[PDB]
């Protein structure tokens, strides 16, 4: 359906937590090695011809690198299902 999910290549670390939640009838998530898997050479990816937009991949809040995005149906791009409100800070000392 709408709102595809689109794992980012350059940020992925290959932890594989994204791959767990995808239903076994849908093997939409896979691996790519192209090198030695100790300096980050087994990044995963999503197959768009099998994905059925479960949101199990995004709504689970598991990606630690922000590699899952879940682009919105019209044009919008997400990175995590909710973000804190970005305040700004200092130091205090009660005299």
């Amino acid at each position: 359906a709408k709102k595809h999910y689109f794992i980012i290549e350059n940020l992925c670390v290959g932890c594989g937590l994204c791959l767990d939640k995808c239903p076994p009838k849908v093997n939409a998530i896979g691996y790519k090695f192209y090198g030695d898997v100790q300096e980050g050479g087994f990044r995963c990816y999503i197959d768009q011809a099998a994905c059925i937009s479960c949101s199990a991949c995004f709504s689970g809040d598991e990606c630690p690198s922000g590699a899952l995005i879940e682009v919105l149906p019209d044009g919008e791009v997400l990175d995590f299902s909710y973000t804190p409100p970005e305040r700004l800070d200092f130091d205090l000392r009660f005299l």
């Binding site: 709504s59 299902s81 909710y82």
Partner: protein, 358 residues
């Protein structure tokens, strides 16, 4: 001590729907700021879709009260439609009865809402605008049958007052907002302009003469007024595909106040962007208006907000925190929620926001 016992419930619907059920109970042991006691009231609001092609809906309202050994009743029933997104049309009728006196009326009204600006930067830099200044214009034509002696007396006195004095147009605002209401007008953020009378006529009718009056007035706001800043939210003509209701009742006395509210209607939850939805921003006029009676007795607070979501929806960024998750329900009690409840029961307008997704 003066404990304040209150009980709240919201129930939502899934999908793209916006309907909701609302339930409320309340109790205080404080004397209401009414110079006549006791005072009781029931309110029925019903609305059904007249027809969706025109956008016309039919809305009814009934009020009964007993104010210090005096029965008062007000019935109104009308048809409303949005002719444009900033014009609204209404045709309705009703009656009012106090004690033994009673009389009917039929009105014919239009309302136009205008904002002072339309800058799109305000639309791309602020995700959740709150204050929005504007002005409303009301054009009313109402007919009342003159059958009682007192109706004829009021009519003749009004004609004489309108003819004789040159300051009727602005002094009418003194009689208009009786008692403390007038004061709220300044503080609640509103400004009522002088009315403009377009002619008082009398014409023969079915049983006798009928007084016809048509008049125009306007009122502006600095943003706190919901009827102006949220002109689009308060009349959800889209989601009214089935009848909706609001049904409340308070019952005051010399020693505390009783409240009881049911309701079911759309517009409870709105889109918040990025797939998340939210409970609608709390209206500000009721808060600041009730703040003018809620500062008379310091009180203890206990309450329980209980929100029920549909399948697969999760609350994220609830500020203040909730206390329990009974697998679909979320409950707020004590602590920061109690502090916020005490804050808003005195006129405070701090934001308690709930975002939910799926």
């Amino acid at each position: 001590v003066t404990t304040a016992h209150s009980d709240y419930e919201i129930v939502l619907e899934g999908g793209s729907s916006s309907w909701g059920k609302v339930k409320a109970r309340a109790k205080v042991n404080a004397p209401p700021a009414s110079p006549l006691l006791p005072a009781d009231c029931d309110v029925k609001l019903n609305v059904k879709p007249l027809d969706p092609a025109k956008g016309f809906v039919r809305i009814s309202a009934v009020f009964e009260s007993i104010v210090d050994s005096t029965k008062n009743k007000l019935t109104i029933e009308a048809d409303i439609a949005n002719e444009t997104k900033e014009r609204r049309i209404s045709v309705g009728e009703g009656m009012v009865s106090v004690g033994d006196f009673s009389h009917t009326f039929s009105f014919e009204g239009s309302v136009v809402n205008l904002f002072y600006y339309r800058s799109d930067a305000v639309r791309r830099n602020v995700p959740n605008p709150i204050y929005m200044q504007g002005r409303q214009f009301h054009d009313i034509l109402m007919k009342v049958p003159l059958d009682n002696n007192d109706l004829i007396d009021t009519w003749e006195g009004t004609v004489k007052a309108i003819g004789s004095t040159g300051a009727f147009n602005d002094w009418i605002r003194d009689f208009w907002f009786i008692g403390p209401a007038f004061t709220a007008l300044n503080e609640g953020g509103q400004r009522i302009s002088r009315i403009e009378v377009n002619g008082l006529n009398t014409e023969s009718g079915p049983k006798g003469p009928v007084g016809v009056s048509r008049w125009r007035f306007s009122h502006g706001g600095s943003g706190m007024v919901d009827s102006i800043s949220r002109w689009a939210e308060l009349f959800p003509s889209d989601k009214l595909n089935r009848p909706a209701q609001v049904e409340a009742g308070f019952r005051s006395d010399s020693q505390g106040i009783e409240v009881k509210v049911d309701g079911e209607f759309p517009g409870v939850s709105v889109d918040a962007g990025g797939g998340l939805r939210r409970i609608l921003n709390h209206p500000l006029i009721p808060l600041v208006h009730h703040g003018m009676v809620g500062k008379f007795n310091n009180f203890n607070v206990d309450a329980q907000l209980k929100v029920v979501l549909p399948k697969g929806y999760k609350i994220r960024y609830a500020a203040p925190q909730y206390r329990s998750q009974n697998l679909e329900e979320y409950r707020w009690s004590g602590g920061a929620y109690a502090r916020w409840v005490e804050h808003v029961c005195k006129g405070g307008v701090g934001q308690f926001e709930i975002l939910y997704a799926q």
